[PDB]
Design a protein around this ligand. Structure first.
Ligand code: POV
Ligand code: POV
Ligand code: PTY
Ligand code: PTY
Ligand code: YZY
Ligand code: YZY
Ligand code: YZY
Ligand code: Y01
Ligand code: Y01
Ligand code: GX0
Ligand code: GX0
Ligand code: CA
Ligand code: CA
Ligand code: ZN
Ligand code: ZN
Ligand code: ZN
Lengths: 669, 153, 669, 44, 51
């Protein structure tokens, strides 16, 4: 048998104390009043005694929402320590008002204060009541602060310091506490969410709590925007300066839900189709014909803007959608010329052809536009855009091409057949670089999928899955390098000269593959091509009769095949499935944020002409404050309605019924 | 690592199917075994430029059926020098049934199992990783083994 | 503007009728009583008037659970038609008892009766109250009944007939109505669930409702089994005759949940490990060593059973687990001999070797065991097992092999080299058939995965996904046949003789593939092998300079590749994913049912010896009734507890409070 | 006529389905408090 | 709510007719240009009422 006793004993209550606590629980006002009056005289009952659950009489009265018994206990001067915190957590306005007018165990940490707890409960009534007085919340220090106080607190007690910081940020990120006590609730929500996201990044632990607090701030900003009821209010909000300034700030803080607001998107769409008033209601054929017409007329629009910007055609290109169409048409003509550029080849360093002469101004315009964007935007913004990396690569390659061409033009005059050219001849390197540049230039069209409704979210999904692909590539490369090292170690003894080969061809790119694993570089290439099955099996064979060596090499090759294809590739498929399912929910918001950034990029005056043509306050504050006041009122009302539309409710109902029953029985009897 | 368990579970039935078809193909083809001298380059087996004797012995049949999973086994290996077209057709049918089972059926079922297991274990990945990392960190708290090789000797 | 009016007008209530209905809704007993007494004299208020929702005063009283006002209305003789149905649906015992003691619109169809509605509500109290009287439910006819009444009702009104049949089956399948009024609740649940499943199969519409009713009956049987509290009760239940007879009946009706009951499984496990009392608590190595020892000693156990069944070794094989081990060991030795059978070949029809002579008794034993199982079990049971099909194939092939061998032995004596043998020589056909038989024999080991905990549910999952594979194979074959027809139509003009080929080899199984699409059979084979990439591209090339024909053939081949691989194979993967996710939940129950069938197959005396050694009542009814009574009581109590542990509840609370308030105000004032 | 029958049946069925929140508990408390105040006024 | 809807329809109540989906009258374009948010909200409210 297992004897069961009380290992951690406490102080039991007497019979009279238990009876008094039972009377308090049942809500019998008369018996509780008699017990208090008798305790004043006989001192037989301790009014501050706890229960087996640790609650005192005052805590029992608070938990039952019994205001009469609460006031009766308060009038008899019972212990009140931390009772206000319990009243606030219970979210009972009457208890809070009663207690405001006036080391034991506690359910609240020592750093919790009444205003902080009210903010944690996000109860607008109690938060407003506490802010009516002079209450303050301590300022959290910098995320990476290194002052003496922060390091001293961290070293003395890391748990307490982290808990206090989390409690402070829970208090500040309260939507009700931001609705009050905040000059600009929208900007406060933006920056508070950004700081919470940064804290989530920095704090490896407590990451989920900071992430959810940041998400809560983002949702509060979105709902405040949702409360707008007219286009005038929306324009006032988005144009406020601390045009579309606040929208730009929201984009800066990655407020995807705020930007993808349907009314914000509608306003941005009206700005986007400046020229066409009825683009929303048109047939597919009409839109396609209009887009084709504007694309084919892009040089005329660019020339008209160059000559006279103030005309029906001069300023027609400054419209965002028209500007986008013209830039896309210019890039498409550039790609068409790139395709045509491959339609005498023995000249060493030939002069550029007509197609190359037409291509050159586009390349110069691309370089000039890149450096102009670099100057106008800045450094950090330029480097934050990943597409710019590709642009840089393209430009560099093109520049290299030009350089090499010039070199080949000045260093060579004779016409020698390409068969006997040097391997590192300038023309061959220039042509290879130009081909790579063509590949990258055509691949640059992916970024335009954002402008499309059907292609945008798909591109978002693929870009997000590229992260899982990158994660898997590391372990794949580790396995590939391991097996390459092993196969090269095994096979490098049987390396044969190219002369001994049947066609004087050495390597795996010959008709009969040979020396697949002779060198580490060739072993890497062989193991790569085996993924796609282009490496034949007889490459694991050697001229000598070393059948054990051939079998071991074949076994290494087979194990590599099994791992890379059966195991790693299926695991990659499973990871992609999971990630795509995870990101399918938020694809629309991500796409709309990306498309909003694309649209905003075409609102600026700079960069109007596509290549190659580019180389040739108090009242506003008062209006914003009035609109913000209206939005805050509407948001508070809506959230109260949503909250209004548990076991403690049934406990309160029972308490009310019992109190009424005792009152009636006392009045009658 | 957790999906490796599903891989191990699937490997048993795959090996059963592979052994069955290897037994059948060897039983059918072991009569037409040819010497290495008769081969065009004195090379016998499937690791030659022209594959031959793919199903002559049980070991070679196992290797041929393994390499057929990755497509490195050519079709003409189901051909014999004699004019036994029925035997060649039956051997080719056995090879094709093995291909259908191992690739179309077994591999897709393995993919489905991996999907289910990965979805199941995605929820608790963080706790498992933190437990493993805690064990790794604790392994470096002890005085013993401070010096890495070769300084430990 | 859209004018809004009442298109379907009704009869509005007067002011006094509306006031009376409001008084009834509020529960004011005094005003309702006064209104009734005044209506008796002045006839100014219609006591049977409806409301805008169609409810009368009696229906309002019933819906509020106001028994006092209900009785007051009943004492004044108000219209009571269909009020009992509303009382039953409300599941109020007091209303039902009041109404039992005593063409307008109705919420219940005309075929609904009080007992049927009570069964639909599955309320044990009301069902018992109605069954206390003499109530009956009409018998549904046969599922495929063809009497005059059924066809007449179906032709006159199919909707009404189907609705009435569904209502009757909803009534009968009520767990409370089966707990009462049923001699054998378990057998009734089994057969009722089976019949509901058959109706679901037959009725293309209403399939989901019959499926859920059948599932409900299965769950009721499982819960009744769950209520057993001792092994004596469980043995009495499972051994009842209308051993393990009721368990066999449950297996017959595919009661998977009933069979996979943990207590049923525990009893079956104790029966399964008859010899070993402590097999549950043993190490893996001990179990493996014991299994290997018993497997290696299987011939000794078989011989001991043959000689003297009554000994420590004679009856040691009759134990189910030992019998399974011996049969598995015998089959494994047979497969080992099959493997050894491939270790002079110029003899036409050679005599059987030592390995073949050892194989022959195993084949004879397999055939004898198959026919013995066919005789002992029956025809329908034998053909219902799909594995038997494979067995049949194996046996047939083996028989064919033997026949051909005999033919080749008697028809040929000379030793001619195999190179110049006929294509259809008996020896070649016999060897091909034997190889196919070996493949099938080794593949037969899949059925033993059921006996394993880790391999069982996996086999269940793969078997269930084979259905999706079969479904996909139809459309794949349609596409394959279409493209084969097209490619053959295009290419059959350029068929070349085998002599013209470089090595006198014609077809795709040559070193240089040729005539890939010349004939329909060869086109089918080429398109099949292209799925696995073994068909080379140059097969779409012809000797003539018909570049258009070659391009069109290559385009057909490429379209076939795109469809079969990119489209069809990925769709197959998606289908397999969905089906595996769907069937992962019930894998354990399916596996345990299959394993129970496997275990039961080894409980019988017949078939004890594996090949080749196989060729050398009133008191019981009273006990079952007592146990069933105990189970029914426990099940009723448990289900009532589970149900006890809506807006109408709050409406009833408000009604009670208002009635109390009116009573107090009348008593005081 | 058929549409009238269908509309009646649909209305009844949807009302039944809707019948079969914190504001409900607030209303219950309000009713109890009103009854309590009425009784206390009537007695006292 | 069927009860309240019936009570209000007992009187003479009307709901404004929404225009064509691709209507191009002067009133629609004027309302869209003056306040797109208000016009869209009113159209959505009308269609919520009718449906
Ligand atoms: C992000 C990209 C920016 C940079 C790209 C521009 C690179 C400009 C480089 C120019 C050097 C050209 C030298 C020509 C003179 C011949 C002799 C010689 O030095 O050959 C040299 C070879 O040099 C190469 O082959 C460089 C090739 C770089 C390819 C990068 C592709 C990136 C594609 C993905 C994006 C050395 O060879 P050796 O010593 O004679 O032997
Ligand atoms: C479920 C299986 C049960 C049936 C299988 C046993 C079949 C027994 C059959 C025996 C006929 C043998 C005839 C020998 C005499 C030679 C001449 C001859 O008639 O050849 C004949 C060819 O006949 C075949 O080749 C049959 C091959 C059947 C293979 C079935 C494999 C099933 C595998 C999956 C399972 C006709 O050829 P011809 O007209 O000369 O030209
Ligand atoms: C020696 C011989 C070499 C031969 C080379 C042959 C050609 C190689 C081609 C390399 C492949 C380039 C692939 C470019 C397409 C990437 C698709 C990105 C998908 C996506 O939406 O991500 C966006 C950013 O992408 C990006 O930023 C993409 C950047 C790609 C940089 C590649 C540099 C090389 C959004 O990203 P974001 O806007 O959220 O940020
Ligand atoms: C002309 C040359 C021909 C060359 C042929 C080469 C060899 C061909 C081999 C064919 C493939 C046979 C595959 C047999 C394994 C099937 C796996 C079944 C999975 C499963 O659990 O289903 C069970 C029933 O299976 C089953 O019943 C399987 C029945 C298979 C019948 C095959 C007849 C041929 C449960 O089913 P259950 O117990 O619920 O019912
Ligand atoms: C992430 C990285 C960790 C994953 C770790 C382990 C994964 C399991 C590795 C098992 C690889 C063994 C195969 C090596 C090999 O057989 O060499 C062939 C070599 C080639 O000569 O052949 C042999 O050595 C012997 C012939 C037996 C071949 C049959 C072996 C089958 C084993 C399973 C194959 C699975 C294919 C599934 C396709 C659906
Ligand atoms: C787990 C293990 C149990 C799975 C059990 C069964 C799976 C189904 C087995 C069916 C295999 C039949 C194929 C054998 C064969 O055709 O040999 C070729 C041989 C090669 O000579 O060709 C023929 O015998 C006749 C030519 C007809 C070929 C077309 C047959 C198509 C059948 C379906 C193919 C599915 C491909 C799907 C790819 C998306
Ligand atoms: C279920 C059945 C219904 C499915 C219906 C339709 C599915 C789409 C069919 C499209 C097939 C077109 C391809 C035919 C063909 O190109 O012949 C080659 C032939 C071979 O000569 O080449 C050509 O005719 C012209 C060269 C252009 C080849 C590029 C065409 C790419 C089209 C998409 C390919 C998708 C590959 C995706 C892999 C990730
Ligand atoms: C598929 C092969 C033939 C490559 C074709 C290359 C280009 C001709 C395609 C690739 C991506 C296409 C672009 C994808 C995105 C859009 C957005 C599209 O706009 C919309 O879809 C919605 C209306 C709007 O832009 O506001 C305008 C066409 C455009 C530039 C497309 C123009 C044609 C592009 C450049
Ligand atoms: C993987 C390759 C080498 C093929 C091996 C073929 C056989 C040697 C394997 C295949 C399936 C195996 C069987 C799968 C199922 C079982 C159940 C197993 O029992 C259990 O797992 C739980 C204990 C119990 O049976 O009650 C006993 C071994 C046995 C017959 C296995 C014996 C060994 C078998 C026949
Ligand atoms: Cl070699 C290259 C270099 C840079 C770039 C980047 N870049 C683009 C590309 N856009 C045009 C359609 C898809 C994205 N337009 C530009 C206009 C001005 C400056 C840079 C520009 C593309 C290609
Ligand atoms: Cl050629 C063959 C024919 C039939 C069969 C069916 N069969 C089996 C197969 N069992 C043994 C282990 C896995 C399933 N045992 C038997 C005992 C008696 C009778 C038939 C029997 C297998 C192979
Ligand atoms: Ca750029
Ligand atoms: Ca059988
Ligand atoms: Zn600090
Ligand atoms: Zn009938
Ligand atoms: Zn209009």
């Amino acid at each position: 048998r297992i004897p069961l006793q009380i290992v951690r004993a406490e102080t039991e209550l007497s019979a009279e104390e238990k009876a008094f606590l039972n009377a308090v629980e049942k809500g019998d006002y008369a018996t509780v009043k008699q017990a208090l009056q008798e305790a004043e005289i006989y001192y037989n009952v301790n009014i501050n005694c706890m229960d087996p659950l640790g609650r005192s009489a005052l805590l029992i009265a608070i938990e039952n929402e019994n205001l009469e018994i609460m006031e009766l206990l308060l009038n008899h001067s019972v212990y009140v320590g931390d009772a206000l915190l319990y009243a606030i957590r219970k979210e009972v306005v009457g208890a809070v008002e009663l207690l405001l007018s006036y080391t034991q165990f506690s359910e609240f940490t020592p750093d919790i204060t009444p205003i902080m707890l009210a903010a944690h409960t996000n109860n607008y009534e109690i938060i407003k009541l506490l802010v009516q007085k002079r209450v303050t919340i301590p300022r959290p220090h910098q995320i990476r602060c290194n002052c003496v106080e922060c390091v001293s607190s961290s070293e003395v007690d890391s748990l307490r310091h982290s808990r206090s910081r989390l409690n402070i940020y829970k208090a500040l990120a309260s939507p009700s506490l931001i609705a009050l006590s905040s000059e600009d609730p929208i900007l406060t929500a933006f920056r508070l969410g950004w700081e919470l996201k940064e804290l989530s990044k920095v704090e490896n632990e407590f990451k989920a709590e900071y992430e959810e607090l940041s998400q809560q701030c983002k949702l509060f900003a979105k709902d405040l925007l949702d409360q707008a009821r007219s286009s005038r209010e929306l324009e006032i909000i988005l144009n406020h300066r601390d045009d579309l300034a606040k929208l730009k700030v929201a984009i800066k803080y990655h407020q995807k839900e705020f930007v993808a607001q349907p009314n914000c998107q509608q306003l941005l769409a009206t700005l986007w189709y400046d020229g066409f008033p009825g683009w929303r209601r048109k047939h597919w054929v009409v839109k396609l014909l209009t887009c084709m017409t504007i694309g084919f007329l892009f040089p005329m629009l660019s020339i008209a803007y160059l000559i006279s910007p103030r005309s029906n055609l001069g300023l027609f290109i400054k419209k965002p959608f028209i500007k986008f169409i013209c830039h896309t048409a210019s890039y498409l003509t550039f790609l068409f010329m790139l395709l045509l550029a491959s339609q005498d080849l023995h000249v060493q360093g030939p002069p550029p052809t007509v197609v190359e002469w037409m291509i050159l101004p586009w390349v110069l315009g691309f370089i000039w536009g890149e450096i102009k964007e670099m100057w106008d935007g800045g450094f950090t913004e330029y480097i934050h855009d990943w597409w710019n990396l590709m642009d840089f690569a393209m430009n560099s390659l093109y520049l290299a091409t030009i350089s090499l061409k010039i070199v080949a033009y000045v260093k060579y005059n004779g016409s020698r057949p390409r068969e006997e050219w040097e391997m590192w001849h300038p023309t061959l390197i220039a042509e290879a670089l130009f081909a790579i540049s063509n590949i990258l230039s055509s691949l640059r069209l992916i970024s335009l999928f954002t402008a499309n409704s059907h292609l945008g979210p798909l591109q978002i999904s693929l870009g997000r899955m590229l992260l899982d692909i990158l994660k898997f590539l590391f372990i794949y490369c580790l396995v590939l390098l391991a097996f390459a090292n092993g196969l090269n170690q095994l096979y490098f003894y049987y390396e044969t000269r190219a002369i001994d080969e049947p066609n004087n061809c050495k390597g795996i790119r010959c008709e009969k593959q040979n020396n697949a694993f002779s060198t580490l570089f060739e072993t890497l290439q062989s193991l790569f091509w085996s993924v796609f099955g282009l490496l034949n099996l007889y490459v694991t064979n050697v001229k000598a009769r070393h059948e054990f060596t051939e079998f071991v090499g074949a076994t290494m090759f087979g194990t590599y095949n099994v791992i890379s294809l059966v195991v790693l590739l299926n695991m990659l498929i499973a990871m992609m499935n999971n990630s795509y399912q995870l990101i399918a929910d938020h694809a629309d918001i991500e796409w709309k944020f990306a498309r909003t950034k694309l649209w905003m990029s075409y609102f600026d005056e700079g960069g109007t002409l596509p290549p190659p043509f580019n180389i040739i306050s108090l009242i506003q504050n008062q209006h914003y404050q009035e609109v913000i006041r209206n939005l805050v009122k509407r948001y508070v009302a809506a959230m109260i309605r949503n909250s209004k539309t548990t076991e403690e409710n049934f406990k309160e109902l029972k308490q009310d019924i019992s109190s009424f029953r005792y009152e009636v029985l006392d009045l009658l009897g």
